């Protein structure tokens, strides 16, 4: 045989050493990051990301630095699909929420439309 059947839901929260405060109070966010509108490139909108809810950052009394108490503050996980991220969030007991991938819709472009006979889509300058 050398194989057993486990029909249970996969849960490894007792094995990952994570304190319970950072399991049952954190909200994982599964999302494709939006394209930076400073730029036209789309190579950052290719993958799924799991981030967490941001916690308190306060002013260090000595230097004014951003002191934190959140260990999961810098934790960004990268996934190829949505279902991989959902399986990884459910595997670790993180309550998550999922945004859908927003693609730009197919535009209808025409350089000749800049110079129409009767339509408003004429350019007045070029």
Partner 1 sequence: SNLIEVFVDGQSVMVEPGTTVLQACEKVGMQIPRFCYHERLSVAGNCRMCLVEIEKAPKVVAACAMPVMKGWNILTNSEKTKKAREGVMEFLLANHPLDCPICDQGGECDLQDQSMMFGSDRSRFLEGKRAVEDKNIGPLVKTIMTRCIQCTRCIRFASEIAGVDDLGTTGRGNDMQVGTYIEKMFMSELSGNIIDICPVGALTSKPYAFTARPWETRKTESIDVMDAVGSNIVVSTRTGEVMRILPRMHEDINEEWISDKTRFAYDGLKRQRLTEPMVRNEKGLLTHTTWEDALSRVAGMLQSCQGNDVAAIAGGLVDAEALIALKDLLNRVDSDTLCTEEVFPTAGAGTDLRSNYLLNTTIAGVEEADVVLLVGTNPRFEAPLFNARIRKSWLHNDLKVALIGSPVDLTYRYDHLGDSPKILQDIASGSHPFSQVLQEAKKPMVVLGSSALQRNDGAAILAAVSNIAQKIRTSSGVTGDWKVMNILHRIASQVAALDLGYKPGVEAIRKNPPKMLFLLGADGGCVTRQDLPKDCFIVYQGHHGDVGAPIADVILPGAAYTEKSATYVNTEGRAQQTKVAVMPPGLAREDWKIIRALSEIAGMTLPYDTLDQVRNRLEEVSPNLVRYDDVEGANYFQQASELSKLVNQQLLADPLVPPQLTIKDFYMTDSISRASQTMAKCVKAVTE
Partner 2 sequence: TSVKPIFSRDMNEAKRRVRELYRAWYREVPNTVHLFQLDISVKQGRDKVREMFKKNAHVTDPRVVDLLVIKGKMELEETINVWKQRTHVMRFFHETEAPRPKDFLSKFYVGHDP
Partner 3 sequence: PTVKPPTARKFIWTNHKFNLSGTPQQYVPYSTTRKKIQEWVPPSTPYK
Q: Which residues contact 2 (CB under 8 A, 6 or more apart)?
A: none
Positions in 40-69 near partner 3 (CB under 8 A):
59-60, 62-64
Q: Tell me which of partner 3, partner 2, partner 1, none is bound by residue 83, counting a contact when its beta carbon lies within the kind-specific cut-off of 5 to 8 angstroms.
A: none
Q: Tell me which of partner 3, partner 2, partner 1, none is bound by residue 8, counting a contact when its beta carbon lies within the kind-specific cut-off of 5 to 8 angstroms.
A: partner 2
Residue 48 or 94 with smaller CB distance to partner 2:
94
Per-residue contact flags (x/-) with partner 1 for residues 45 to 74, judged by CB under 8 A: --------xxxxxxx-----xx--------
Q: CA-to-CA distance for 27 and 33, rounded, in angstroms? A: 17
- Tell how strand 77-79 and strand 48-51 pair up: antiparallel
Of 1-9, 10-18, 78-86, 99-107, the segment contacting partner 1 by CB under 8 A is: 99-107
The answer to whether 73 and 83 are in contact (CB under 8 A) is: no
Element (H, E) at 24: helix 21-24
């Amino acid at each position: 045989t050398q194989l057993i059947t486990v029909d249970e839901k996969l849960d490894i929260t007792t094995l990952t050493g994570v304190p319970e405060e950072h399991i049952k109070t954190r909200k994982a966010r599964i999302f494709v990051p939006a394209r930076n509108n400073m730029q036209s490139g789309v190579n950052n909108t290719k993958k799924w990301k799991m981030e967490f809810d941001t916690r308190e950052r306060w002013e260090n009394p000595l230097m004014g630095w951003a002191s934190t108490a959140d260990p999961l503050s810098n934790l960004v996980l990268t996934f190829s699909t949505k279902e991989d991220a959902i399986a990884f969030a459910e595997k670790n007991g993180w309550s998550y929420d999922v945004e859908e991938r927003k693609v730009p819709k197919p535009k209808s472009k025409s350089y000749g439309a800049n110079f129409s006979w009767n339509k408003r889509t004429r350019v007045s300058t070029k």
